[PDB]
Each structure stands twice: as structure tokens, then as C-alpha cells.
Design a protein around this nucleic acid. Structure first.
Lengths: 141, 87, 230, 180, 85
RNA sequence: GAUGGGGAAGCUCCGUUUCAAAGGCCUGACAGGCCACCAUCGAAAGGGAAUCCGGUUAAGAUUCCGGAACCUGG
RNA sequence: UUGACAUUGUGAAGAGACAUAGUUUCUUUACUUAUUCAAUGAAGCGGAGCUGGAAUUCAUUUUCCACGUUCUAGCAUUCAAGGUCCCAUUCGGGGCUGAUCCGGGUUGAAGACAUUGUCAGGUGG
């Protein structure tokens, strides 16, 4: 009744391929596939340069004028799956696959509401866990 | 009729966190996760998290406590504790 | 970097809240820890007699290690080995018709205390081992004297579970060795020559000295400052 | 003892009191239920945890609300404050003083009463002080005492002139009235 | 066996070593509870010749009593302290 | 007035937070971290969440009926 | 109300009796482990160390002191900011310092007397 319901869809993975990453796709599928990712990344680049001009503005102003679904993580971001126009042909031996299925299927896991988004993150301690010497080595005299 | 101690029903009586669920089960995160996926139940989002978690919009998970009631009587858990004793 | 600044607090004596410090020196321990630390402390501070503290003076690392490396060759047969021996010998006596001696002789340590002390005063031992850590010490105090009397090369091992490891019991509090395969006869005979090297002259100084004349650090610093001023 | 607000006690001999001082503040001055003297709700900052720790001192005269108390061992000699008795010279009048250090006061507590340090034994630390009765007594220095007399001296001078006032008096402490 | 080497030793209740151990164990037992349990005796031969057999079901409690007579003072409490325990 | 604990030959007693390992969480990868009490009982006249009217019966109503509001928790 | 037994430990001398040497009679202090008293959410006990300062040095410091707070009815809490080094970028994870190092005696009083268990004098509705 509660175990028998399907999970929530956090940010959408699609199982279907674009059919542009396709071992000599149709060239329009190729073109639109590069174009969408170009839009997506140039947006990130423009906000990057916004941070850059922000930072240099503040660095000027420091000197110029005067003085006297939880865990803080969404699904991990998808990476590029593209072959450029030079590295594609017939003679399938040429084919270099691209895209890490670990990252991608883990995105599917976190996307389809099965698991929470997380680091594997390594060790950590709060306090010193003090060292000192045993009675026996202390008093062997 | 003994005024009813606000935060104890509805959201705060079906939605329970990881931390409280392993206070219940006493066992581990990792056996709690192995059990989760093996007996698969998945985390949820409630409609009002502040009123669920007593004022607090701290980002965390909730697990449909009825499912934990299911997880208690489960044969695999005995076997995991037997793995511990064996080790 | 510029946007963040150095606060630093002044904890001082009164003008702050204090941070969290080590307080293991200061806690309300439970009653059993407050017993079993004070017990060691008391047995340290008190002027023990020398019939005890012929304990408390004992083997070195390598001597103990070669001792146990030897004894870990001659164990008892655990029950697995016994039952295999039985299912062998049942067929062996059913077909071969031996006297239940078709199976060979064992060569193993002999680990009951009463067994040990019975073998002593027949002088059927060549080395016995003794555990320091026994709070019912009356069980054990007579052993080095008795072994001295019967001229058997006693030895006070440190650790009783260490002795249980080679009998397959939790604790044995002794072990002995009376008969050995030939291939460690020299090992044993030389081990005896290490042991008496470690003990035969130490016997003069263990007994003329009443251990545990020790003080704690505050009283020690008190008398040190007194001797310094005087 | 229905209305007794709290025992007229002192702070404890903590690290601040023992290796320094502390600023602590009065909030009000209230009449005790069945006592010849008044008391003082007075508050400090607990230095180990974040909160304002209340304390209940006895109200020496001269002290007003809205007042501070630097107090411990390194406190300046002023009315209302407290010190262990080694730092002061002879003659400093005090009250509510301790028999042993940290007992939070046995002596010189009642209304309009005090005690008078006259001597020191600085080596092998003690301090000589006279009682209100006048019996001399020498006690360790680490124990403490509040400056000044207990407020309300001259409570005794007034007669009562009728029995109902005495009944109202001795209803509060103890049924030791009417006496045979 | 060690039976007699313990028996003939524990008769010597005034030697230095046994009065040392007595000074130790009396303080231990003072700080522990009045009634309590030790999972192994301090006098095993002396147990073993009363009916002890070290197996599953035989138990040892250790116990403490005041000394002195029945105060109502000079009434002398015909119950032995051993029995009282 | 329990329990801890200690006495008492003992029925049961002294004591009520104290010579106690008393209890529960909060994230977060079985490990770290914070908090500090102490039971419980005792007021139909003390504190305290919130309701009025009219009608009605052989007999009751701030209780039912007709109408109209309020409190708490979801 | 006084005395005796044990609880009841370790010490250094003096006077001694004994085999240079251990066994016990007292007089002296001197101590902590027993026990006793009290308090604290059992938080800062004791020692050493830095920094500076008197200190008068009879060489070098013999030493001894201080070692973050005072006109004022406020406020200080989310492992603390900062510095420093790794990490794997990232939203920040970790170490050392900031906040000295070591012991364990929770902190003092008291200590072989107290006291507690048991006995014997004077007094005594």
C-alpha cells in the first residue's frame, strides 16, 4: 500500500537516446545535438564570466576609492556525450566509445527516486584522540 | 480531553528520519541500506517539512514508518547479525 | 580573504564561555572502575612482602616468544582431531586388531594445575610455566618455592590467556612439559639454560626486597621540593 | 517556610573565584519570609555554559539595585563585594563569613551584625577575626566573607506593644509561641 | 594437588602476606555492595570440601554483616552471624 | 511515598535525588557529537482551552430538540 | 565521663638487648594508602614549561613575582573565526595551532589519634 507505489521523479533522466550519438547519425541530428549542449554550456560560461567581472570589480573596489531532495545535492550533472565531426566515420574499428556508464547509471538511480544524492566521503574526526604512554613503558626503569 | 501535544501526529507520526529509524533498528547505515534496497522502499518528500521536523527545514530523508514496521519482522536481519557473530 | 576577518576570542578567566576541554581526569567514573583502578594503585603503593614479587619480575620479549613458539608445536588434540582419531582407530581395531595403540603416542603439554603439582614431586617435568595474573594468588605462591625444592626449571610467564591459547581453554594458569619429540630436545635444553640465566641470580634480589614502596606524583613532588629546600 | 525564597548562600569556590574574579549583578532586593534581614537576587554568567546563573546573597547595607559586584580573589575592596580574607588588611569589616572554605556561610549572618578582622597569620595562612558575641577565632584565609554589615540594624530597638504582632512574628518561623 | 598447599597456608592467618591480602580484600569488599556475587571463590579448596562442584548451577554470593550484639546492647543474639548471612 | 543504597534477627524501616553505568537523541559516513532531569501520588472550593438562548417531560438539562458560536488536534 | 584489646599503615633518628647486621622497648617529629568529614551537572588539582618583571648576581640566574576582565542595569551559544598544511573541487572533507607539556589523586580538611565492635572505674529517679 506504501511499499507498492513507485517513487518520485527528481530531475528527469530520459531512457530514450537522442539518436544523434549514433555512429554517423543524420547530420541534422548531429547538428542539433551539438547545438543544445552548446547552448547549455555557454549559459554556464556566461554566468562564469559574470562571476569573473564581479570578482575583478570587487578587487578594484578594495583599493580604488578610500578607506580610513535533501543532503544539499541534486542529481550529479550530466557530462558530454559527443564525437566531433573529424572523429567519426564508417570502418567501425575507428570507434572510440565515450561517456562513463557509472556516472550515467548513477544519475539514473538518483533521478528515478531510488537513492539519495551523496558523496562516498572519506574519514573524519572531531577531536584529537590523545596519545600517551602505557604504565609499563612509563615505569620500566 | 487533555490537550494533544502538537507535534506527534500525522506528518510527524508517519515520516521518520534515517537517524530515528536506526535508533529503532539499532543496527547500521549499511545494513539499513542493504535492507532498504533489498526490500525496496525509497525516501520521500512530505508536503510540510517544517511541521514534520518540529520547526526545522533541515535537508534530510523520510521513510514511511509503516515500511519500518514491515522491516522489523524480516528473516534477513537475523542473518546479518549472525554474520557479525560469525566474524 | 578580505571579507573574512580574524575574530579571535579572549577566553580569559571570566570574560567568555569556556570551550570543551579534556576532563577525563575529572569525571564521575562508575564504581567498578573506581574500584579496579584503585586496586592497581594500592598494590603499587603498599609494601608487598617478597613471597609475592617473586612475581612481577618476569620474562623478556624474545624469551617468551621462543617459549611459545616451541609450545605451540605440542598442543593437545582438540576434539576434532580426537574424533578423527576415533573413527580411524575403530576401523583399525576392528580390522587390524591392535590394542588401541595402532595410533601413535602423543607429545603434548600438560596443563591442569593438579596434574602439574602431582607430576612435581615425581620430577616428571622439565619446564613448567606460571602466570603472574591470578588474583586468587594463594593458588600459585607455593609453586616457585616448590619447583625450586624439586629442582625443576620454573618460569613465570606474563599472561594467563597466553597460556590458554596453547591448550584451547580461556585460562590455564600453568603449563608444563614432560616429554618431547626429539627434534626440539636441544631447543628445550637450551631454553632451560636461558631461564636459569634469567632467574638463578635474580632469586637473591627478588626475596630481599619488599616491592611497592612507590608514591604518587603529588607526594613525590612534595618530598622533592622539601629535599630541594633543605 | 512556605515563602522562603532561598537560602542566604554564597557562590562556590570555582576557578574564577580562586584564580581571579567575576562581575555579577543584582536584579532586585526582596524581603525574606520570616527573617530579620533582607536578601538579594543576584546573577552571574556561568562560564562553562551559556546562561545567566542566579545566586541568592544576603543584603548588606548600602547596596542598591542596578549594581555590579566584581568578586572572587582579585576584587577591589568595596562594599557589597566578596574576597577570601587574606588579601585585605586587618580592620576590614565583613559579614556572612564562612567557617570553612566553600561552606557558603555560617557566621555573621543575622541582622545588623558583622565581624571585625584584627589580625593575620599570612605565613601558614589564617586570619584573626572577632565575633559579634566577641569570641576571638582564627580561621583559614581561603574562606570568604562579604563586605559590610547586614542591612537592617536597629530592628531590635522597636517594642511591639501588643500580642497579635508577636503572633504574626512567630507564625512564620516556628511554633515557639505562646511560651509557658 | 594444591589442596593441602592451600589448606596448610590459609591456616596461617597472621603471616605478613595473608594479613596483606586481608588488608586488600577487606577494602575491596567494603567498597562493593553488601550482598554481591563473585564468579569464582577466594578459597576454592574450602569450597570444594563443603559440596561445591564447579559446574553449571553452583553459585557463590559474598556477603557482609555488622559486628556486635543485638541492640534493643547486652543481649547476645543466639543467631550466629554465619546463619544471619 | 517507590527504586538506588544502607540498617534491622525480622515483620518491614531511614531516605526522595542522594556514595547510580537511571535516560534520547540530531545530522552524518557502525563511527563521531550535544544535552541533564530525575520517579510517581495529593485540591470535584486553589491554577486551568473553549457555549448561549428559546422550547421540551409526570420527573433531568449551560447535557436532549430547533437555531446560532467557540476551543483543541489533524 | 576515664582507661584497656583490635581495627592500625610506612618513616627517620636518639637511648638501648640481642644474632658488620635483622629481630622490638620507649621520646621526637614527618608522611599517605586505611578510616572519618564536607562539596561540586565529580572543570582546571599538582609538577614542568614559555613570556615579561623585581632579583643581587659572587656567574648565570641562586633565585621570587605577575602571566589577558573594573566608571556604566547590555550581548557573547550551532566543533570558533583566523593562520598553516594536505585533499580533489565543491557544495567543502581532514590535521596542527588558536587554547602550552606530563601525571591521573574529583577538590580540600583530618589522619594511626579520632572512630567503630567489645570490656572495667567515679557519678547517677
Amino acid at each position: 500500500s506504501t511499499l507498492d507505489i513507485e517513487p518520485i521523479a527528481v530531475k528527469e533522466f530520459t531512457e530514450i537516446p537522442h539518436a544523434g550519438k549514433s555512429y554517423n547519425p543524420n547530420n541534422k541530428a548531429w547538428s542539433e545535438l551539438i547545438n543544445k549542449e552548446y547552448k547549455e554550456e555557454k549559459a554556464r560560461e556566461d554566468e562564469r564570466i559574470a562571476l569573473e567581472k564581479y570578482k575583478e570589480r570587487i578587487r578594484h573596489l578594495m583599493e580604488t576609492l578610500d578607506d580610513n531532495l535533501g543532503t544539499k545535492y541534486s542529481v550529479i550533472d550530466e557530462r558530454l556525450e559527443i564525437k566531433f565531426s573529424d572523429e567519426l566515420s564508417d570502418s567501425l574499428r575507428k570507434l572510440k566509445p565515450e561517456g562513463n556508464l557509472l556516472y550515467d547509471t548513477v544519475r539514473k538511480l538518483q533521478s528515478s527516486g531510488k537513492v539519495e544524492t551523496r558523496v562516498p566521503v572519506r574519514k573524519g574526526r572531531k577531536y584529537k584522540q590523545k596519545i600517551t604512554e602505557k604504565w609499563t613503558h612509563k615505569d620500566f626503569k | 480531553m487533555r490537550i494533544k501535544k502538537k507535534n506527534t501526529r500525522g506528518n510527524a507520526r508517519n515520516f521518520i528520519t534515517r537517524s530515528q529509524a536506526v535508533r529503532k533498528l539499532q543496527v547500521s547505515l549499511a545494513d539499513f541500506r542493504r535492507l532498504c534496497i533489498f526490500k525496496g522502499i525509497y525516501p520521500r518528500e512530505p508536503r510540510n517539512k517544517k511541521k514534520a521536523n518540529k520547526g526545522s527545514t533541515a535537508p534530510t530523508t523520510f521513510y514511511y514508518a509503516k515500511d519500518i514496521q514491515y522491516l522489523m519482522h524480516e528473516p534477513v536481519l537475523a542473518k546479518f547479525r549472525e554474520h557479525k557473530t560469525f566474524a | 580573504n578580505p571579507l573574512t576577518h580574524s575574530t579571535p576570542k579572549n577566553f580569559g578567566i571570566g570574560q567568555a564561555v569556556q570551550p570543551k576541554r579534556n576532563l577525563s581526569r575529572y569525571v564521575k567514573w562508575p564504581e567498578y572502575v573506581r574500584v579496579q583502578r584503585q586496586k592497581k594503585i594500592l598494590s603499587i603503593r603498599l609494601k608487598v612482602p617478597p613471597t609475592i614479587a617473586q612475581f612481577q619480575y618476569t620474562l623478556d620479549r624474545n624469551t617468551a616468544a621462543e617459549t611459545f613458539k616451541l609450545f605451540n608445536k605440542y598442543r593437545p588434540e582438540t576434539a576434532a582431531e580426537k574424533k578423527e582419531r576415533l573413527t580411524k582407530e575403530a576401523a583399525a581395531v576392528a580390522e587390524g586388531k591392535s590394542k588401541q595403540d595402532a595410533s601413535p603416542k602423543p607429545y603434548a603439554v600438560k596443563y591442569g594445575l593438579n596434574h602439574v603439582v602431582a607430576l612435581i614431586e615425581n620430577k616428571k617435568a622439565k619446564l613448567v610455566l606460571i602466570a603472574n595474573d591470578v588474583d586468587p594468588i594463594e593458588l600459585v605462591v607455593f609453586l616457585p618455592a616448590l619447583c625450586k625444592k624439586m629442582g625443576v626449571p620454573y618460569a613465570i610467564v606474563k599472561g594467563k590467556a597466553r597460556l590458554g591459547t596453547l591448550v584451547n581453554q580461556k585460562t590455564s594458569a600453568v603449563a608444563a612439559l614432560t616429554e618431547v619429540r626429539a627434534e626440539d630436545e636441544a631447543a628445550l635444553a637450551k631454553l632451560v639454560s636461558t631461564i636459569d640465566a634469567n632467574f638463578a641470580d635474580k632469586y637473591d634480589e627478588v626475596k630481599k626486597h619488599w616491592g611497592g614502596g612507590i608514591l604518587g606524583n603529588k607526594a613525590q613532588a612534595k618530598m622533592d621540593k622539601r629535599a630541594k629546600n633543605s | 517556610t512556605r515563602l522562603r525564597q532561598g537560602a542566604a548562600k554564597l557562590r562556590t569556590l570555582d576557578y574564577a573565584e580562586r584564580h581571579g574574579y567575576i562581575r555579577g549583578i543584582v536584579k532586585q532586593i526582596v524581603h525574606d519570609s520570616g527573617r530579620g534581614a533582607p536578601l538579594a537576587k543576584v546573577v552571574f554568567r556561568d562560564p562553562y555554559k551559556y546562561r545567566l546563573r542566579e545566586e541568592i546573597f544576603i543584603a548588606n547595607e548600602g547596596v542598591h539595585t542596578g549594581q555590579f559586584i566584581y568578586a572572587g580573589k582579585k576584587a577591589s575592596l568595596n562594599v557589597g563585594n566578596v574576597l577570601p580574607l587574606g588579601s585585605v588588611p586587618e580592620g576590614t569589616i565583613v559579614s556572612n563569613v564562612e567557617e570553612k572554605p566553600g561552606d557558603r556561610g555560617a557566621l555573621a549572618r543575622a541582622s545588623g551584625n558583622y565581624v571585625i578582622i584584627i589580625g593575620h597569620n599570612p605565613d601558614e595562612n589564617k586570619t584573626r577575626v572577632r565575633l559579634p558575641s566577641g569570641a576571638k577565632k582564627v580561621i583559614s584565609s581561603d574562606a570568604r566573607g562579604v563586605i559590610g554589615v547586614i542591612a537592617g540594624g536597629g530592628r531590635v530597638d522597636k517594642p511591639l506593644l501588643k500580642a497579635g504582632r508577636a503572633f504574626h512574628k512567630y507564625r512564620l518561623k516556628r511554633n515557639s509561641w505562646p511560651k509557658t | 594437588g594444591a589442596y593441602k598447599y592451600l589448606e596448610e597456608l590459609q591456616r596461617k592467618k597472621q603471616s605478613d602476606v595473608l594479613r596483606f591480602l586481608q588488608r586488600v580484600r577487606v577494602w575491596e569488599y567494603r567498597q562493593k555492595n553488601v550482598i554481591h556475587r563473585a564468579a569464582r571463590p577466594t578459597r576454592p579448596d574450602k569450597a570444594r570440601r563443603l559440596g561445591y562442584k564447579a559446574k553449571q548451577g553452583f553459585v557463590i554470593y559474598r556477603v557482609r554483616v555488622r559486628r556486635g550484639n543485638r541492640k534493643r546492647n547486652e543481649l547476645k543474639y543466639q543467631r550466629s552471624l554465619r546463619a544471619t548471612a
